Design a protein around this nucleic acid. Structure first.
Ligand SMILES: CC[C@H]1OC(=O)[C@H](C)[C@@H](O[C@H]2C[C@@](C)(OC)[C@@H](O)[C@H](C)O2)[C@H](C)[C@@H](O[C@@H]2O[C@H](C)C[C@H](N(C)C)[C@H]2O)[C@](C)(O)C[C@@H](C)C(=O)[C@H](C)[C@@H](O)[C@]1(C)O
Lengths: 118, 113, 214, 122, 54
RNA sequence: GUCAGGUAGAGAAUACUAAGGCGUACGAGUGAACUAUGGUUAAGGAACUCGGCAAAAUGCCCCCGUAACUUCGGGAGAAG
RNA sequence: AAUUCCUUGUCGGGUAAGUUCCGACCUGCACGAAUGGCGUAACGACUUCUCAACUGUCUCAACCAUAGACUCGGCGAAAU
RNA sequence: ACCUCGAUGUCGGCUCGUCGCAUCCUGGGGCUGGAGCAGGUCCCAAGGGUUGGGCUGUUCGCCCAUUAAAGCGGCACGCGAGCUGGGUUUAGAACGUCGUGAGACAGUUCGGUCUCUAUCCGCCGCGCGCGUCAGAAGCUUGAGGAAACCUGUCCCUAGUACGAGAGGACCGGGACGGACGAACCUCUGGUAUACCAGUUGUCCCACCAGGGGCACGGCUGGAUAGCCACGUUCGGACAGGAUAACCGCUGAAAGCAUCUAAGCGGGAAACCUCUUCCAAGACCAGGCUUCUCACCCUCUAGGAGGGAUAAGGCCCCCCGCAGACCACGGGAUUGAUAGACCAGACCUGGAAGCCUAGUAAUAGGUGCAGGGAACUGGCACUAACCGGCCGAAAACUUAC
């Protein structure tokens, strides 16, 4: 997607890559994940790109997803449930819902879910 | 698509072969030295092709009298009358800057066919 | 006495002249401007023509502006800006509801293009005023981009106004003068103005006739 | 884009092999010398026997530049080396043979003798 | 540098008054048949049940 | 002070890893200047500066090949 | 004689301008060491200089990241 | 020897300035000791500019190459809570000279810690609050400010007054510049920490294939956007007014009268307009439009105190090339604001799988392939919400 304009989200570019990969894995696993709003914002394009690869169900797209997800179970979940589920939906596979901030740092929080209305 | 494509298409010209970096090509550049318009032929390897539409330029490099000369042209330049692709090149990248540090026979380029 | 037109900096590109010389031209959408109001010395104390530019939705436009445009007799437009003129015959030329097209300019006409420069944010003294940076090595302690000295000593005892310090730069009105209009695309309501004009692509600009090279 | 202390090869048969730019002529604080720009240099290397000796302060005109030079038609000329031709106050080359190509900037600047002697003026 | 004089009460308080909190803008949300006040930012989360209203 | 897995490696260097142990105790964000630590840099190439300070550079193995001078050991991994 | 205060001027070498320094001519009862002065290979994070290479040291600065700075939440000083 | 010894940090360089004129261009007078000319000496009128190196502790200087020129000074010999630390002046050491010695030396040398989070004023930028006589809203409008102001060659005039030559103009008219500044990113070039590719070591994804983590983004080759300069374009102006020196008046208070007297009229870069920018907090606050043209309650029914508000605006929300934290665009979808998706552009450079050829490394076809970002269009698929806060007149005096 468009790169992070400001300082990378994990304190480094490598940590941002790993953090987005883990957040995408968790989202594709549990449907919805609660995380700091900036992480949700950065993940939504990342996760939707992965879901697009899943929709383009092919071995090449499987490899393109596995070069970021690294979790075979979640990759299968993508290509067997989330690609078929979003076959008819053109974009906007994720939903960010702003929730209350944390008590320890007042960090803005958001729940990012997979869209299911169809 | 680009917002200024409706402006660029007017200046975009035909008669531009499908040359690619690594292709040996001779460009016929009009030179108007001394009120006389003549054609000077720059024959060399296309080592680069950057840009899009009207603003696209291609760089041609040739060794001449012991001095390597790169000469860049706009692809759709009206000062170029004809670009003739002599032989295609089987290079493995878009830009051939490495040809600057190479000289002699080591500056060979594989030809597709 | 001095033509002018509100437009939008569509972008920048290059064309070629009759001599095959490359002309870097900013492409500006000198779109239709509707004369909304005429400023007169009798009513306003100066001679100026108010132009309106750009399509806006009436829902977006507010009631004060909507009423001003109604009184003018024309549909509300996004931007409104005044063109100052020297004499009263200049405004006698204009009339409310008038259609101002890019053809008011001709190929080869020199124009002054006014626009709001790009926002450079809070800039340091090196970027903002061209301050010679201090040394990168040879002992320099954490002053590689700092201003240096600011004043004198006890005798001024203070820093003079206008001292070039670091602060927010850009986003200011800039009038680039004597820019040649390479071509006037009447079909697209566009001007190819040789060179650069201030501001980002899509920003409001005012292309007036060159005040110097009239 | 040649400046002070830049070393240029002599594209001329004057015996001088290399020169060090002392000054770029053209105006006070004139910073760079492109093709067709004149510089007073000093010969740092030279053929042991020849008209020009090592450590000679000479005038030369840059005939080839590594930095690509833009041209009116939007084209650019770039060379593999910075080369100057040693000239005299008549703006004519001190030597008789010019080696390697040269730019049309010499023709524009009226270095016509250099342009004529050059094997290829690009 | 170091403060040269003790700051007067007037100046200290004039500039200390700027350290103030901004009250959140609360909008009404109906959840479990009850009308609670939540920020419009959390309006959607409260409707979806993602806000802990205690 | 003791033990000293693997793969590269001469190696107990170094990189990555096994076992094992940790994420170490303010966080979240945010492309301001500026500072610090890293990175890259056209064309020049010490013109900087008290001073090549800093950086940059050379860097390993094998074949060759190695100067002035020398206390005959060296210099020497000369240099190339 | 090997003796460099040498200010030695003169001349050159080295730079376009070349310091350190290197040479001959130099310098008269000299001048300073019959043992305290000269040499001396090797060595040196010693002082000084010239080269090749290299480079953001500089022409002349630009951009990227990170830690600060900045914003929010918690805790919460200091010199004066 | 008047402040400072319960501390006012030195020389030089750097950085950043600011001011004076005691002039290194622009205007004149004299010399024309130029009879003349190119030139130059001298004396009267700050806007800009006034280079880079070597040797110098080097405050000074000299030298090299330029320049239109390489000005002189003040500002704590401006500037160390801005930098350096070469000089200088601690503590180590050597040499020279003095001293019996400890030691001394405006003697020669090497080495030798530059602290501080800015409270006030000041300055550079940003906001918040009030004003600005109703509550808003666009468009402004210059009182006052700031910025800028530099100057070269070459050509024509013209080989043109001297009229011996050598040499060689003023004044005007063109071309191309150097330095500086501004904007901008089409080109060129730099960068590129979610782009593409190659590749080393290692460990993983069971394995092969294909990938991933780490090693500076591991390294390397490219690299759109943005930001940039080394790039592109533009600017200094053209005119007007008032001003030293040069004059005009009929000629006097004064006689053939007289530059001129007292009076009155005309001729630089400096000054004021002109150009660019800020600007009504310009306390002396413009032509328009919007609601209204008071909705209700309470003490007084004076003067007030609160709600609701019409108008518009915040705050939230989606955002930006706008940003330290502000304001600008979109949005309560009556929507393309961002993301996604679909294309295009562009960058990489020929994906994976399969097949073929090679005992293999690998190569070829599938196939301008694959991957991907900033740009451009579409596309409401996701989020811009079934929402909260602010936000209207006391009137009186004076002509028609
Ligand atoms: C890092 C930490 C220390 O920083 C320094 O050492 C700096 C670098 C010294 O400068 C260093 C370097 C240098 C050159 O600095 C001026 C030098 O002169 C002094 C002697 O030592 C300072 C500032 C000295 O002052 C200067 O002393 C001079 C005698 C006069 C001067 N002023 C009154 C005129 C005065 O400010 C001085 C004596 O240390 C100040 C006293 C209060 C201290 O001892 C304090 C505790 C310091 O130790 C310190 C600040 O913590």
């Amino acid at each position: 997607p468009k790169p992070t304009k400001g300082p990378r989200l994990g304190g480094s570019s490598s940590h941002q890559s790993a953090l987005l990969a883990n957040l995408a894995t968790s989202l594709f696993e549990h449907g919805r994940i609660k995380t700091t709003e900036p992480k949700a914002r950065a993940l939504r394009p990342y996760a939707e790109k992965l879901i697009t690869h899943a929709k383009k169900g092919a071995l090449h797209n499987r490899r393109e997803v596995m070069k970021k997800i690294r979790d075979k179970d979640v990759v299968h979940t993508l290509f067997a449930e989330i690609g078929p589920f979003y076959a008819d939906r053109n974009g906007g596979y994720t939903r960010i819902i702003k929730v209350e901030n944390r008590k320890g740092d007042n960090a803005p929080m958001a729940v990012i879910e997979l869209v299911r209305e169809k | 698509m680009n917002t200024l494509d409706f402006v660029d298409q007017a200046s975009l010209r035909d008669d531009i072969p499908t040359f690619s970096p690594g292709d040996t090509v001779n460009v016929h550049v009009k030179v108007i030295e001394g009120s006389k318009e003549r054609i000077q032929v720059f024959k060399g390897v296309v080592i680069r092709r950057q840009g899009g539409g009207i603003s696209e330029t291609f760089t041609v490099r040739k060794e001449s009298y012991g001095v390597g000369v790169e000469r860049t042209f706009p692809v759709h330049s009206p000062n170029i009358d004809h670009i003739d692709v002599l032989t295609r090149g089987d290079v493995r990248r878009a830009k051939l800057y490495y040809l600057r540090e190479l000289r002699g026979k080591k500056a060979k380029i594989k030809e597709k066919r | 006495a001095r033509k002018g037109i509100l437009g939008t900096k569509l972008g920048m590109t290059q064309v070629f002249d009759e001599n095959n010389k490359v002309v870097p031209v900013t492409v500006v959408k000198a779109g239709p401007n509707v004369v909304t109001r005429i400023r007169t010395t009798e009513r306003d104390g100066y001679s100026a023509v108010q132009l309106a530019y750009g399509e806006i939705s009436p829902r977006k436009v507010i009631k004060p502006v909507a009423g001003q445009f109604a009184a003018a007799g024309v549909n509300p437009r996004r931007h409104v800006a005044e063109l100052r003129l020297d004499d009263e015959a200049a405004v006698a030329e204009y009339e409310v509801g008038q259609e101002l097209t890019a053809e008011i300019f001709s190929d080869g006409a020199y124009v002054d293009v006014t626009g709001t420069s790009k926002g450079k944010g809070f800039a340091g003294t090196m970027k903002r005023h061209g301050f010679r940076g201090q040394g990168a090595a040879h002992g320099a302690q954490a002053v590689h981009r700092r201003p240096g000295s600011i004043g004198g000593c006890a005798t001024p005892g203070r820093v003079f106004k206008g001292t070039r310090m670091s602060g927010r730069m850009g986003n200011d009105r800039v009038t680039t003068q004597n820019l040649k209009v390479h071509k006037v695309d009447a079909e697209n309501g566009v001007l190819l103005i040789k060179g650069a004009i201030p501001g980002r692509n899509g920003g409001l600009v005012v292309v007036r006739s060159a005040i110097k090279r009239g | 884009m040649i400046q002070q202390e830049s070393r240029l090869k002599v594209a001329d048969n004057t015996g001088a092999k290399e020169i060090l730019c002392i000054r770029v002529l053209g105006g006070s604080s004139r910073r760079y010398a492109g093709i067709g720009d004149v510089i007073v240099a000093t010969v740092k290397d030279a053929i042991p026997g020849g008209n020009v000796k090592r450590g000679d302060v000479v005038k030369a005109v840059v005939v080839r530049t590594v930095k690509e030079r833009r041209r009116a038609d939007g084209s650019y000329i770039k060379f593999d080396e910075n080369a100057a031709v040693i000239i005299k106050n008549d703006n004519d080359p001190r030597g008789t043979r010019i080696f390697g190509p040269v730019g049309r900037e010499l023709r524009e600047k009226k270095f016509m003798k250099i342009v004529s002697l050059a094997p290829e003026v690009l | 540098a170091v403060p040269k004089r003790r700051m007067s009460r007037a100046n200290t308080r004039s500039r200390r008054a700027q350290w103030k909190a901004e009250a959140p803008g609360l909008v009404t949300v109906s959840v479990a048949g009850q009308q609670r006040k939540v920020p419009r930012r959390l309006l959607k989360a409260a409707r979806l049940g993602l806000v802990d209203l205690d």
